[PDB]
Design a protein around this ligand. Sequence first.
Ligand SMILES: Nc1nc2c(ncn2[C@@H]2O[C@H](COP(=O)(O)OP(=O)(O)OP(=O)(O)O)[C@@H](O)[C@H]2O)c(=O)[nH]1
Ligand SMILES: Nc1ncnc2c1ncn2[C@@H]1O[C@H](COP(=O)(O)OP(=O)(O)NP(=O)(O)O)[C@@H](O)[C@H]1O
Ligand SMILES: Nc1nc2c(ncn2[C@@H]2O[C@H](COP(=O)(O)OP(=O)(O)O)[C@@H](O)[C@H]2O)c(=O)[nH]1
Ligand SMILES: [Mg+2]
Ligand SMILES: [Mg+2]
Lengths: 430, 131, 332, 435
Amino acid sequence: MREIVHIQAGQCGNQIGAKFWEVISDEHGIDPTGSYHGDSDLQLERINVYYNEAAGNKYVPRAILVDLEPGTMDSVRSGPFGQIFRPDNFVFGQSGAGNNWAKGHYTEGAELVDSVLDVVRKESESCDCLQGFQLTHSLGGGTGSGMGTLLISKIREEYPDRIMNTFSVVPSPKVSDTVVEPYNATLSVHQLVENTDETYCIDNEALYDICFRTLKLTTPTYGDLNHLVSATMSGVTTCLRFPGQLNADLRKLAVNMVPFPRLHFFMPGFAPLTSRGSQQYRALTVPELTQQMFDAKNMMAACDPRHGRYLTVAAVFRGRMSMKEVDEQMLNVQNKNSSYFVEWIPNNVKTAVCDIPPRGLKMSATFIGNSTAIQELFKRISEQFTAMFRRKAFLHWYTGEGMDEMEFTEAESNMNDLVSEYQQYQDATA
Amino acid sequence: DLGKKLLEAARAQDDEVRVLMANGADVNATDASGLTPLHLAATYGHLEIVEVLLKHGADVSASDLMGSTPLHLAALIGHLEIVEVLLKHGADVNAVDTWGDTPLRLAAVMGHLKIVEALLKHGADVNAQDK
Amino acid sequence: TCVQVALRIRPQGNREKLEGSRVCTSVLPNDPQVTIGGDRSFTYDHVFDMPTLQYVVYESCVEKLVDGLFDGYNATVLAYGQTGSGKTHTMGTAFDAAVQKEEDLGVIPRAIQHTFRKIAECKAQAIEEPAFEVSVQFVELYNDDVLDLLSDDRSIRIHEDSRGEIVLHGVEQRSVFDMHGTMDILKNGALNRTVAATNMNEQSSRSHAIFTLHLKQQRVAEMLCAKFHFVDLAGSERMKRTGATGDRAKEGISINVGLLALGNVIAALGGVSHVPYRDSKLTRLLQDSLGGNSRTLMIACCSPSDSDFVETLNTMKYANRAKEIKNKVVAN
Amino acid sequence: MRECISIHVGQAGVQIGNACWELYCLEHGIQPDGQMPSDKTIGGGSFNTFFSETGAGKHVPRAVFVDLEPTVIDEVRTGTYRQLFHPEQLITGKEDAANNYARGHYTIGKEIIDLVLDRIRKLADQCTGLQGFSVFHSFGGGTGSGFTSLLMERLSVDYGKKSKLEFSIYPAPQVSTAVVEPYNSILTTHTTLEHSDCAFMVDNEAIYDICRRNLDIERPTYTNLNRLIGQIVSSITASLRFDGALNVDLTEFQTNLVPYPRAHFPLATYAPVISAEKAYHEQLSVAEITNACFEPANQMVKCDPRHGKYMACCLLYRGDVVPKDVNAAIATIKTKRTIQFVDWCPTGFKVGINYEPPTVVPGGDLAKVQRAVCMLSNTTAIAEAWARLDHKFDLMYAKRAFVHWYVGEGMEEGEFSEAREDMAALEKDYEEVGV
Ligand SMILES: Nc1nc2c(ncn2[C@@H]2O[C@H](COP(=O)(O)OP(=O)(O)OP(=O)(O)O)[C@@H](O)[C@H]2O)c(=O)[nH]1
Ligand SMILES: Nc1ncnc2c1ncn2[C@@H]1O[C@H](COP(=O)(O)OP(=O)(O)NP(=O)(O)O)[C@@H](O)[C@H]1O
Ligand SMILES: Nc1nc2c(ncn2[C@@H]2O[C@H](COP(=O)(O)OP(=O)(O)O)[C@@H](O)[C@H]2O)c(=O)[nH]1
Ligand SMILES: [Mg+2]
Ligand SMILES: [Mg+2]
């Protein structure tokens, strides 16, 4: 299947999603003007997955840009690559969503969708072969969580037989201390469970702790969190963007990764962890790109992978190395640590490889796991949700907006079930 | 009933709060929840009205029907100012609602680190997790 | 406190006979066991062989359940098996414009008349009549949408109750007063069930239908509510035998996906810590039928022929384990 | 002359058939454009039945290459061999079977199965006699497993009279592209069983290890395995191209190798595997390369033939092989080695010899040897490999892991439990002929 349509919604989504477009444009050799100036034929070979061609050998991404507020799409036009994006695929309104799921899902934005959809339809009738869609959105509340989980639903009945995946940033106290945030995650996670084929769990709590206790950056900006994010959306998509054999398309990756239909949530992982300061420590140990990915402290989700079992892992080493120490030492991680991979899924760890790394790095790995450790993520948002719910705290921002208390109770049943399903398979046997 | 309307002024209206009390409206009125006006003002952030109510006879430790004190609620939402004012007027830190929690844990779970410090000064407990 | 399974074998059909198919199933006279293809054997609570008429089915296993309604005890009767094995005919969720009734009337219809007789049978007394409110709702799950069969359609939602039970919001729940009118809503609902033809059945069910009967009673020492679900499942299909294509075959896939999710739910309850109810909307709608707070009969339907062998094996293999399933019942 | 048609299905099928026709062309001095030097034409009596002659002396393989995605056959359409094959023979779709057996057999396959049939019709309507089809596919691929079984069902109702030989890949984790390959392998085996007459399975691990110590390739690519695999296929199809004594017809494969209908999975063993690296190498006598045919390191499926009973042997020699010395080596396996046969079956060792010098790829890793051999034992010990595969299958099916991808793609759940029980019966089939 060839070509992927990317949509970015919300403030967060539009910001990471533009860093995404920025980074992979470097890897591929498209400059802000859309002309190719790269030093490989390997870069142009599968360029059509994320870019369209045009008059003059120009390459304009397949992104829709979506926001209920303009203030995030006026500043991206004013960024390095806001020139290249097509102008008709900027779909802002003005209302805003007050960091409310209901306001994005039902009130405001329910009027801006069916405008987003009409350009979604547009870029997709140009497709020889559609893989599906990727959304960059935030789970923390507002135009990205509520419109985002409305786009995803309305896109599913129109293209039911296409793959839906998301990069879904997960809210933490430690980053935004916005009281109303555990509500809008449990409202989004309810919809992601029903309607996505795979979700990456970029968890702002994890990104905070890496930027503060690993990178030692005492006051973390949205730039330093996003840096760690864009390095991850390069790894987890590289298999889609360069020629290769393993997890090469959205559907093949889903079929390698999702054992049970509902457990389609992955925690990423990245080695080597870097800051924007641009100090590059490398060869400080080389085969142990295998012990770094598999470490808690390199995950992008606040989960200790040792507190459960892996179900499907996908390691992707980028750079210039030996495909033969990669093999040996990835077979070692699985046989030092044999209990941490479920047994009723034999050969559950697949290992791809790439020959071009990102800029900055001579060698870099990337990690895509379906671990049951992930339940620390949801149990965290479960407890913070149930705290705010039990006291009916702030519940009238939503009932006011043509919602209902049962959505709240329902959305908490779903994710709590998710938790115990992950916990059955974290403990199964024979 | 004026008490109902003072309850709705505390959720929202600092002017209309002292105009409704000088008409003889119950400081310690309750809704069906059991929430008094000092409750509804310490959740939703209003510092002035929180103190106004306290200079005129509010039970700083009144629980609702699920055992919620004014500082339980004030810790949950943030509102460190309202937590301190509530503490100097004799508020119970080590008090427990019908769910088993304490205003400490409500402030841990939600990440209001500024407040968990203050809470721990005037009294902690051993129900919660070590952190 | 535990799920009843009953298995019911149909007579060979005209295709089967005229095509050379032959009997491999074997039940003994007045015996709750069955034997298939010689070797492999199973016992149930009931086994009704190929000439068992409709009223024999009702009395032996369903008469008790309808009673228990008046005793505030919920019940379930779901038919489960392969396409063309007699699910819809057994349940009584289908009606032919020109046959006539002609007796031969399924579970749901006979269940109506039972209800409306024990109501007046109770109303007769010297100590003053108990008042009853009988209502009905009637949905189909067609390609992962809950459609309402009681209305002029085009949505609906599935949520958990206050006691934790599964309630359908946005489904018409209209009230009924005697046999003749409860019956006429059953016919006009069946008129809306999505049905079309496959090579395995000229009237193949393209959805799962649930006829839920509600009976809130008020009497002297109290108030006794009890729901009763009548699930007429779509049968599992194989694309090579149905001949399905397009809109047809898509229906057959989403049927199979939900019967998959019913499979694992049967296995987890018996066969442990989790039970995959949320894999399908079908298995959410059945979450109290199999979980608990229903009294549940499974009527498992089987072709007798050997042209439907491995299929009847599967049906039997799940039916057998389903006996092991603990329903936990309380009066409402 | 009676013709054979090659169908190559799915990625492995296509890239192995590409390596096969490469070696075929070299073996009859045909060029990558179809043309042949008149130096190598004969007076009629050109026993290429795998090749079709046209006017202007182009030789066009009797082959159909089929993939549900376009990338791999695209690399046949613009490579060295864009000239050899007619484009009609090269059929692609756009969406693959995302490593899903059910996509290939039930949904994405049913949308391209008619066009394949009717193109493969054009190769057949141009044959005067016809024996059937040599079909190349993979057990773990989606199209390999799933579409192949759909083609066999239908090449068996059309051409019901015709013989069906398959060369089948058996997956190894060292080159696994996917986790459901055990699902895919037991699925394609159950549905194809009743439609194949003989099936030589190629364990990607067996080949991978042979490439690792005999050719000393450390991390082998598909291009190493295919070179080596392209060899053993040519030893099989030597007779069908060189008017030989043994296996003259496709039926005689079934005649010699497979007595019982379901137990039709022989064990190919090959020698010598000699690296082009070695500077000087004393070529290996018939007696040497025949004793290597009983060394388990050289077979193409991992199992212990010693733990199992033989029920048919054929040995196929190639090059400078004198027939007297063949029988000295054969009579001495019967004494230097203990090789038990089925309680009820003739003991013998058919022999063929080909007298043509083994060809290897020029500038490849295999070294041109002087007398090679390829034995095709049919052992009960190959049941060992079906057990490996069955157990991996069992581990996941216990949990219904991944099944929901198959049922959502055309399948009924019971098909899984059914296909798995054909196997339970087959492991019992190998249990009863021997011991
Ligand atoms: N020897 C050899 N094995 C291969 C080759 N290509 C793939 N394989 C094996 O084939 C299996 C995967 O099957 P594929 O052929 O790639 O799948 P497919 O037939 O293209 O069908 P799709 O899943 O639809 O893409 C794996 O076990 C690989 O080990 C090849 O060129 N040579
Ligand atoms: N015991 C029986 N005696 C007589 N006719 C029967 C019996 N069981 C089934 N039939 C007939 O068999 C045919 C198919 O039965 P049906 O009740 O529609 O089965 P089904 O499982 O619901 N098929 P499907 O809806 O696609 O799963 C109809 O013509 C019925 O009248
Ligand atoms: N990592 C990261 N998180 C962000 C960014 N912008 C907002 N967030 C987070 O997203 C949540 C707020 O959601 P936001 O995207 O602003 O809501 P929206 O504009 O309605 O979609 C909070 O948890 C923030 O911590 C960003 O650029 N990077
Ligand atoms: Mg039916
Ligand atoms: Mg392929």
